[PDB]
Automatic annotation (TrEMBL):
<dbReference type="Pfam" id="PF09174">
    <property type="entry name" value="Maf1"/>
</dbReference>
<keyword id="KW-0539">Nucleus</keyword>
<dbReference type="InterPro" id="IPR038564">
    <property type="entry name" value="Maf1_sf"/>
</dbReference>
<keyword id="KW-0805">Transcription regulation</keyword>
<keyword id="KW-0678">Repressor</keyword>
<dbReference type="GO" id="GO:0016480">
    <property type="term" value="P:negative regulation of transcription by RNA polymerase III"/>
</dbReference>
<comment type="similarity">
    <text>Belongs to the MAF1 family.</text>
</comment>
<protein>
    <recommendedName>
        <fullName>Repressor of RNA polymerase III transcription</fullName>
    </recommendedName>
</protein>
<keyword id="KW-0804">Transcription</keyword>
<dbReference type="InterPro" id="IPR015257">
    <property type="entry name" value="Maf1"/>
</dbReference>
<dbReference type="GO" id="GO:0005634">
    <property type="term" value="C:nucleus"/>
</dbReference>
Length: 181
């Protein structure tokens, strides 16, 4: 039972009255054998034919789409559409988002313990060496995409990728309205 398991339990259906906050960290090490390997190659080909993400992320992209497939393997992810829906970020741009939307969450957490953000950082750093990571948000517009939560007040899907380890932590967090009419 690690800090991620901690954060995750805390963020499992945090209920704050009218809106309910959900959050989820999942880590994935991309295998270099079997289906992961073949899939990776497929993606790498698709990307090259086609040659918003810049090209600096053409490799990162391969590994992000594997992590999608890992999370929802029955869904058709596509290298080109993801190229469209992934956006590169910085820790700082992530920090602002955490500050502005996960405010009630951080607050409840400090009331509970004696920062949620600091904890998160430490937890991520342990699993993917954070200062060496690349950061991405996934914002699909497609109706079907399973990273799209419909009727949500907001939703984010972040990804922390480590190139050396071929390792990705995905952080999803969203807000739901508990109202009735």
């Amino acid at each position: 039972y690690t800090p991620l398991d901690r954060i995750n339990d805390f963020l499992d259906h945090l209920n704050l009255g009218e809106r309910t906050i959900k959050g989820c960290l999942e880590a994935y090490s991309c295998k270099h054998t079997g289906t992961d390997k073949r899939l990776s190659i497929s993606l790498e080909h698709e990307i090259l034919d086609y040659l918003l993400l810049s090209r600096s992320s053409r490799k990162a992209l391969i590994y992000l789409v594997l992590t999608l497939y890992h999370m929802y393997p029955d869904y058709d992810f596509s290298a080109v559409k993801a190229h469209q829906f992934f956006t590169e970020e910085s820790w700082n741009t992530f920090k602002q988002i955490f500050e502005t939307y996960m405010f009630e969450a951080s607050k409840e957490w400090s009331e509970t313990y004696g920062s949620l953000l600091e904890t998160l950082y430490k937890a991520l750093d342990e699993v993917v060496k954070l200062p060496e990571c690349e950061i991405y948000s996934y914002n699909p517009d497609s109706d079907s995409d399973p990273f799209l939560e419909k009727g949500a007040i907001w939703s984010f899907n972040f990804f922390f990728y480590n190139r050396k380890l071929k390792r990705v932590v995905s952080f999803r967090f969203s807000c739901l309205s508990n109202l009735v009419a």
